Structure 1
Amino acid sequence: LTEIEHLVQSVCKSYRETCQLRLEDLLRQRSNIFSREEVTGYQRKSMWEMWERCAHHLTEAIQYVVEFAKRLSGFMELCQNDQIVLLKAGAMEVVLVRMCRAYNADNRTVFFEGKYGGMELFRALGCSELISSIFDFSHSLSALHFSEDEIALYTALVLINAHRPGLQEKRKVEQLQYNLELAFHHHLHKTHRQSILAKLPPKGKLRSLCSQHVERLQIFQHLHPIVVQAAFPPLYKELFS
């Protein structure tokens, strides 16, 4: 079997081992929806408590994407500067894509702390426009009905992007990117799913939504800082303190 069919398998394996929540569990749990009383309970929480909860869930989700990245062929062989550049730009873009698996377009709910709730769950954060943007992005992805393997290959390409400003070894990233692009294109062809290519977000869209999200996270972190045990300290230090 070709270098490319092995690359498809290695990316899908890495994804399955780092996917954090099982799609089968997320789909089954769709009927499990926060009550009016449970929603009011969350809305009455202080923004500092809701921040602690959301910051920790987002940090944990990022750490799953760091593991994913570390398991991609060639990622660990990049200079550390380039590993940091790709993960700083890319890891939260991958979390925002991964969210569509935990999103129900039927009732516009996301899986959060054991049940499905709407964006009004997060009212205490005072972030309505940003959170509405994140829900809308997930709503856009949900219409693709991404397979686990499509999500794996697409999110590998979200990360392995030679056009990120700051790369020291651009040609090493291009070589990895070309192989992952071929793997993705090969797999869509093999599975009669080339139709999703025309429906993928414009790439400026994910970058710009991600930029707004992280900017807001950095403001909360400045006001009420959380600490975690860094999975990748050089990267952690490029964002935390």
Structure 2
Amino acid sequence: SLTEIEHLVQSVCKSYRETCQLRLEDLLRQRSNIFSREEVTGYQRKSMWEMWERCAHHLTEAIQYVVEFAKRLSGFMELCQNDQIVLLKAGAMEVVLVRMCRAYNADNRTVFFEGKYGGMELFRALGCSELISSIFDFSHSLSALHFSEDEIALYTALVLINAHRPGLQEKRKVEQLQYNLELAFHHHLCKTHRQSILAKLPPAGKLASLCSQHVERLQIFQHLHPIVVQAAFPPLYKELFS
């Protein structure tokens, strides 16, 4: 039923609006609040472990909103808890990375971070130049498409409800949920004359590559500073990534 598909569209968009962490208007209104060169230098002079700790904290809080987003997806809470965990462990960070495009300003290539907008040079103390640049590049691609709030809602639902995740017990059930969400997303694109973005969306594996890079860099950092991760990284971050 077209009515049932459109009810799903409304439900997913509402669930995202309730869990988007930051309203889009608040991010846009801060675009002229840009870090000075002295502030950028201050971030660059911070130790690697302190920059990692702060960034892991911000990622953990953002992941918490993704979990609430999942909990407001009716089909997601119908899955068994094993599959809920599998989907969240595999997809929560991917959802965060997609959500980051709202905090990215394509006009000057800056991202909102700790109250102001800064370029990727702000994150040099992490030692993750490739990861950070790829995140900027990914956010720039979605920003160039003017990815709407409703499109982000439906797309991030599909990022999470991925029936190809290894470890799923009720694979057929996730397949049905994924197909209904695909119909909802594509119906919304058709109704809004936005189907031209289908070929312009980032390819399959690009999001996985970003998540793999994050885990790989964390693996390196944890080898270098195991006590810092143990003593100062958020427990949810460690449960998800280490």
TM-score, with length taken from structure 1 = 0.91
Preserved contact between residue 39 and residue 117 of structure 1 (Cα < 8 Å):
yes
Structure 1 residues 224 and 170: CA distance shift in structure 2, 3 A = same
Identity of aligned residues (%): 99
The structural deviation recorded for 1:219 is 3.9
Preserved contact between residue 94 and residue 208 of structure 2 (Cα < 8 Å):
yes
User: What are structure 1's unaligned runs of at least 5 residues?
Assistant: none
The structural deviation recorded for 1:81 is 1.4
CA distance in 1, matches of 2:238, 2:105: 35
CA distance in 1, matches of 2:108, 2:161: 33
Corresponding residue number in structure 1 for 2:72:
71
The CA deviation string for residues 82-130 of structure 1, in whole angstroms up to 9 with x for no partner, is 1111111111111111011000111110000010001111111111121
- Answer with 189-198 or 228-237: which moved more: 228-237
Instruction: Write out the 4+ residue segments of structure 1 that deviate beyond 2 Å after TM superposition.
Output: 217-241
Structure 1 residues 32 and 226: CA distance shift in structure 2, 3 A = farther
CA distance in 2, matches of 1:75, 1:92: 17
The structural deviation recorded for 1:187 is 0.9
User: What are structure 2's unaligned runs of at least 5 residues?
Assistant: none
Preserved contact between residue 103 and residue 142 of structure 1 (Cα < 8 Å):
yes
- Answer with 108-117 or 136-145: which moved more: 136-145
Corresponding residue number in structure 2 for 1:37:
38
Structure 1 residues 231 and 221: CA distance shift in structure 2, 3 A = closer
Preserved contact between residue 108 and residue 118 of structure 1 (Cα < 8 Å):
yes
CA distance in 1, matches of 2:111, 2:25: 15
The structural deviation recorded for 1:131 is 1.0
The structural deviation recorded for 1:224 is 4.7
Preserved contact between residue 150 and residue 184 of structure 1 (Cα < 8 Å):
yes
CA distance in 1, matches of 2:177, 2:235: 22
Structure 1 residues 135 and 217: CA distance shift in structure 2, 3 A = same
Coordinate RMSD, CA, aligned = 3.0
Preserved contact between residue 87 and residue 235 of structure 1 (Cα < 8 Å):
no
Structure 1 residues 232 and 177: CA distance shift in structure 2, 3 A = farther
Preserved contact between residue 43 and residue 123 of structure 2 (Cα < 8 Å):
yes
Tell me, what secondary structure is at the counterpart of 1:167? Answer: coil
Structure 1 residues 63 and 220: CA distance shift in structure 2, 3 A = farther
Preserved contact between residue 60 and residue 237 of structure 2 (Cα < 8 Å):
no
Tell me, what secondary structure is at the counterpart of 1:216? Answer: helix
Preserved contact between residue 15 and residue 73 of structure 2 (Cα < 8 Å):
yes
